[PDB]
Structure 1
Amino acid sequence: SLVIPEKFQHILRVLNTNIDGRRKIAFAITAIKGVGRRYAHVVLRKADIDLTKRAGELTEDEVERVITIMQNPRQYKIPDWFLNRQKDVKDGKYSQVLANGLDNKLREDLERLKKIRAHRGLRHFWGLRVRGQHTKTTGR
């Protein structure tokens, strides 16, 4: 049980991300942008994966099931309020954006705000604080 298996994977590649196999699975899939601790735990609960095993101990079928549930949360009764992209301003769809998708979403949001020349977009463009913080003394 405590001896390392022959199929143990030191490094996994999931969604163009290097997942360390030495970490526990829940805190190992948090290496993916868009997956935090809460979302990782709920995904693994939906996937019926034992939380006590390391990332390398997972089989290929288990990894594939985890990836599928991660990329399609709504099909597995993961509630909308759990998602980091709710009611998208362009499509109105609920989803969980991950990794390059998350980066593209951030760039698109900033580009839209700058294109309409909203105040927050201008603050982002100038590189200043955008949530009303004082800038006189901090942020140097």
Structure 2
Amino acid sequence: SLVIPEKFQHILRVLNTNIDGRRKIAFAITAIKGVGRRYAHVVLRKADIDLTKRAGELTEDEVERVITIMQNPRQYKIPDWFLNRQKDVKDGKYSQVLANGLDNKLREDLERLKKIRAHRGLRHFWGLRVRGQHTKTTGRRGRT
């Protein structure tokens, strides 16, 4: 019942990001950038997935159902308060994009701040804090 099964997977391959199959399903997903400890648990609850098992026992056909939940959050009834790009500037759809598109949708705002030469992008240009922090006392280890 708990012995090593057949077709045991060491590392799974989803969205060009390593998933450690040695870990539990609810927390091995969180190693993927763009999904964390909260988003990985809910997508196991939006489908009939028993999260008491490990990531080396679930089938390769079932993870295809899992990844379509992240790729289509609104279509699979994921609440809108789990999405990282709510009310996007360009396309305007509320969605979660995983492990390659998150930085892909991060960076165009950075030259969008360069394209408007605003103060918010100037702190990224100078490599300083942007949320109104204080670098007089901190930020010492990263700067020489």
Task: Name the TM-score class by shorter chain.
Answer: over 0.9
Identical positions, percent: 100
The structural deviation recorded for 1:32 is 1.2
* Aligned residue pair count: 140
Shift of 1:97: 2.0
Unaligned stretches of 5+ in structure 2? none
CA contact 1:49–1:62 (8 Å) conserved in 2:
no
Deviation per residue, 1:64-120 (Å, 9 max, x gap): 110111111111111112111100011111110211101111111211112111101
The offset of 1:19, in angstroms, is 0.6
| C-alpha separation in 1, matches of 2:56 and 2:41 | 17
Q: Do the aligned residues in 2 keep the contact of 1:9 with 1:21 (CA within 8 Å)? A: yes
| TM-score of the two chains, using structure 2 as the length reference | 0.93
Which residue of 1 is the match for residue 124 of structure 2?
A: 124
**Is contact 1:10–1:20 with CA below 8 Å preserved after alignment?**
yes
Quick check: which one's helix share is greater? 1
Return structure 1 stretches of 4+ with deviation > 6 angstroms.
none
Aligned-residue Cα RMSD (Å) equals 1.1
Gaps of 5+ in 1: none
Partner SS for 2:19: strand
State the Cα deviation string for residues 110-138 of structure 1 (Å, max 9, x = none). Answer: 11112111101011111011010111110
SS at match of 1:74: coil
Compute the displacement of 1:46 (Å): 0.8
Counterparts in 2 of 1:19-38, with a 5 A limit?
Answer: 19-38=19-38
Cα distance in structure 1, aligned partners of 2:65 and 2:47: 7
User: Which residues of 2 match residues 84-99 of structure 1 at below 5 A?
Assistant: 84-99=84-99
The C-alpha deviation readout for 1:21-57, integer Å capped at 9, x for no partner, is: 1100010111111111111111111121110111111
Contact kept in structure 2, 1:25 and 1:54, CA below 8 Å? yes
